[PDB]
Design a protein around this ligand. Structure first.
Ligand SMILES: CCCCCCCC/C=C/CCCCCCCC(=O)O[C@@H](COC(=O)CCCCCCCCCCCCCCC)COP(=O)([O-])OCC[N+](C)(C)C
Ligand SMILES: Cc1c(C(=O)Nc2cccc(C(F)(F)F)c2)cc(-c2ccccc2)n1CCCN1CCOCC1
Lengths: 404, 189, 169
């Protein structure tokens, strides 16, 4: 929880040699046959399905994000997450992506097939229109359930801090907004306020854009979508500042050099847009309109084209230094923090009896305890090959070198 | 898993003695099976050919390899198990299934210089296992490209290549083909 | 063509675009054309279905949303393919903004469309950026290995086609 690698890596890999105290150890040694030995890590607090707090749920959810990507790789945690991915993890994730995309397809057809008319357009009454009602039913079933799944997980776990915004903090806020808008929409639908379809169409533009969650799990397109929130926040709200230090400048300057109707004048809402047309190509320069100083008006205009090409190239190289490859290593790190979140969120939603059916490792008689009873752990096997230290004959548990 | 008294002794070592072993050969001299007692393989489907000669070379225990060779165990006993299969075929450690091959694979030269050059039964270096691999094919099998592995493999590949040229001058060992057709060079490519 | 079917100009012209794209095999004779023609594949097989994944969520997104800001024929409707022309018309600086078409809530149609402008440039920037770090930070040293494997394969394909006695020459 506190982010301390140095003693976390030592406790999780503690191998106490002497015979008197071997029940304190956590990295055992199962068998050996020449240069192949079976290190046998002890899962005792690392993977406890349900009936305990867990070190893996603490590292993924309630840890410190500066060291979180370094602690989820120590000895067993990296293989423990892949063994919880080769199992239930990967398979039950792609069930959700084919279900949520279909949940947005059905939501889309309810927007396109809608007879927008005044009051509630209710009286379905035919073989065509009951598909529109039943689609709206499924729409609200996405509505109330995304509300509950977000909030009941929010206050209880996952620690809604300001630093987890790329570790499913932003999507923690967007799936709330998707459930807000769909509640307001179906309310205004059944009431009678005509603006229901405007409220409905903000759930179209959000939800398909909120389907960008589900690229998490590939690392091909997953780290790509990390750049989507990276560029748009750290570099677009610091370019649109500097770009609007010229658009509140030049545009409020050039229209000052313009006859006040005494095109003529008093269409500044278009005159703001008319300047923007010139910077991308689709301009006319009819805004000249025989003004008072056309020599002055054109050397400010050709200045503004350069400076908005200067800033546009500056945005590009700001996406080279503050952004890319210094960030391309950090997107790899923050992918695994989103990846390990994906396995655990599935594994937290299973019921306990099924969650115990998908355990990792195996129950191993690991040594004679102090009282003389067998020590029955839940160890996890990691095989390893060593060619240099030719003395792999140690406190071996099973003298028969093999997985029977 | 048809272990006998002698493989059980050779699994459980402590400073490499287990002092039952020379005594248990002496009782085996009085009853008399020794070409069946020392040459009793495990009839398991997981260790199917492993004998007491394999374990004594495994546990790095030369002086108890000398006793089993002097009594003549089964030098060239093939350990045709399922554990002794390659990493693709289910098994963990593939060494070419032979006691000279097991001595050359696990960086163990003094048993290689004893299994081939002894008063008793010799381990000729031209023998093939169940799939064709000789003592030089199996040094290519365990040849992970790390720094320490390539140090003794190239040292033991020559030491078996030279020694076959001395004893058998009419045959280069690196012509003897795997049952896939491969040579020890083509198996490395 | 050997049958009576006159649709032998559709399939033929799919062949004619291939057989000139398939002459990028023969860029494998030079190192400085060979390592360039491999990056055209890695930008296609890796970094082009990546973009067309995300860009076909927004075009299956906002575009299927903006057709709901349209009268249901009461152009009028039934022509959603034409609006897919109209959407892409606007973003690449050749639109007209006449595709409003009386728009039951008009100001919604601006703020969603100008979102589609500013968001898809970020993705179009991200094609210039996320590709820059992932590919050429490594592929400038990596694709020269893949070329050497393509160059050696070509030499062994020319030899193997020869007869034995010519190979013995
Ligand atoms: C090629 C090599 C690999 C080969 C293939 C792999 C080999 C191994 C594969 C093994 C099988 C596949 C594993 C996944 C099973 C799919 C169902 C599932 O995940 O949960 C289901 C039930 O989840 C619930 O929450 C409903 C609970 C209802 C009561 C309990 C019913 C029994 C469990 C169910 C029936 C028994 C199921 C198991 C039957 C064996 C559906 O819910 P969810 O998906 O959790 O929904 C997401 C929830 N979330 C949004 C909060 C995140
Ligand atoms: C939106 C959605 C679904 C989903 O829609 N599943 C579904 C499945 C079947 C039927 C249906 C049907 F049809 F009934 F709607 C729906 C599932 C998930 C999910 C959750 C955890 C891990 C992997 C996927 N996520 C994302 C939720 C993210 N949250 C947690 C914190 O970040 C913000 C909110």
């Amino acid at each position: 929880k506190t982010g301390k690698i140095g003693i976390f890596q030592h406790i999780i890999r503690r191998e106490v040699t002497d015979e008197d105290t071997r029940h304190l150890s956590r990295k055992f040694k199962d068998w050996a046959y020449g240069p192949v030995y079976s290190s046998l890590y002890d899962l005792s607090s690392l993977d406890t399905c349900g009936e305990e707090a867990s070190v893996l749920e603490i590292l993924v959810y309630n840890s410190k994000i500066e060291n979180r990507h370094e602690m989820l790789a120590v000895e067993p945690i990296n293989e423990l997450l892949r063994d919880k991915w080769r199992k239930f993890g990967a398979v039950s994730f792609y069930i959700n992506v084919v279900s949520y995309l279909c949940a947005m397809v059905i939501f889309t057809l309810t927007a396109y097939y809608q007879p927008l008319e005044g009051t509630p357009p209710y009286p379905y009454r035919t073989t065509v229109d009951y598909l529109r009602l039943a689609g709206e039913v499924i729409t609200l079933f996405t509505g109330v359930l995304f509300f509950f799944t977000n909030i009941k997980d929010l206050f209880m776990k996952k620690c809604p801090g300001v630093n987890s915004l790329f570790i499913d903090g932003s999507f923690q806020l967007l799936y709330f907004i998707y459930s807000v808008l769909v509640i307001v929409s179906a309310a205004l639908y059944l009431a009678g306020i005509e603006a229901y379809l405007a409220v409905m169409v903000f759930a179209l533009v959000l939800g398909w854009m909120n389907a960008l969650y589900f690229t998490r799990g590939l690392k091909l397109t997953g780290t790509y979508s990390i750049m989507i929130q990276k560029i748009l926040f750290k570099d677009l709200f610091r370019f649109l500042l500097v770009y609007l230090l010229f658009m509140i400048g030049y545009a409020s300057a050039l229209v000052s050099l313009l006859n006040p109707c005494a095109r003529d004048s008093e269409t500044f809402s278009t005159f703001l847009l008319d300047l923007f047309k010139l910077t991308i190509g689709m301009g006319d320069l009819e805004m000249l309109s025989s003004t008072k100083y056309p020599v002055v008006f054109i050397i400010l205009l050709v200045t503004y084209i350069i400076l908005t090409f200067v800033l546009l190239l500056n945005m590009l190289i700001a996406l080279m230094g503050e952004t890319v490859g210094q960030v391309s290593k950090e997107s790899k790190h923050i992918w695994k923090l989103q990846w390990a979140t994906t396995i655990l969120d599935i594994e937290r939603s299973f019921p306990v009896f099924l969650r115990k059916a998908f355990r990792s490792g195996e129950m191993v008689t690991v040594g004679k305890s102090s009282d003389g009873t067998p020590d029955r752990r839940w160890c996890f096997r990691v095989d390893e090959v060593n060619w240099s230290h030719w003395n792999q004959n140690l406190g071996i548990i099973n003298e028969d070198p093999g997985k029977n | 898993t048809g272990k006998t008294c002698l493989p059980k002794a050779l699994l459980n070592l402590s400073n490499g003695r287990n002092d039952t072993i020379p005594v248990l050969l002496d009782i085996a001299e009085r009853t008399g099976n020794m070409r069946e007692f020392i040459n009793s393989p495990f009839r398991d489907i997981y260790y199917r050919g492993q004998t007491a000669l394999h374990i004594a070379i495994e546990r790095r225990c030369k002086h108890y390899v000398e006793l089993l060779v002097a009594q003549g165990a089964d030098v060239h006993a093939q350990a045709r198990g399922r554990f002794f299969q390659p990493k693709d075929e289910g098994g963990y450690f593939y060494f070419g299934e032979l006691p000279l091959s097991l001595a050359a694979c696990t960086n163990q030269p003094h048993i290689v210089n004893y299994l081939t050059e002894n008063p008793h039964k010799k381990a000729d270096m031209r023998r093939q296992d169940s799939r064709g691999n000789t003592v030089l094919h199996a040094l290519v099998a365990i040849a992970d490209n790390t720094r320490e592995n390539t140090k003794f493999v190239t040292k033991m590949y020559d030491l078996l290549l030279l020694k076959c040229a001395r004893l058998f001058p009419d045959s280069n060992l690196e012509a003897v083909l795997n049952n896939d057709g491969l040579s020890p060079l083509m198996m490395a490519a």
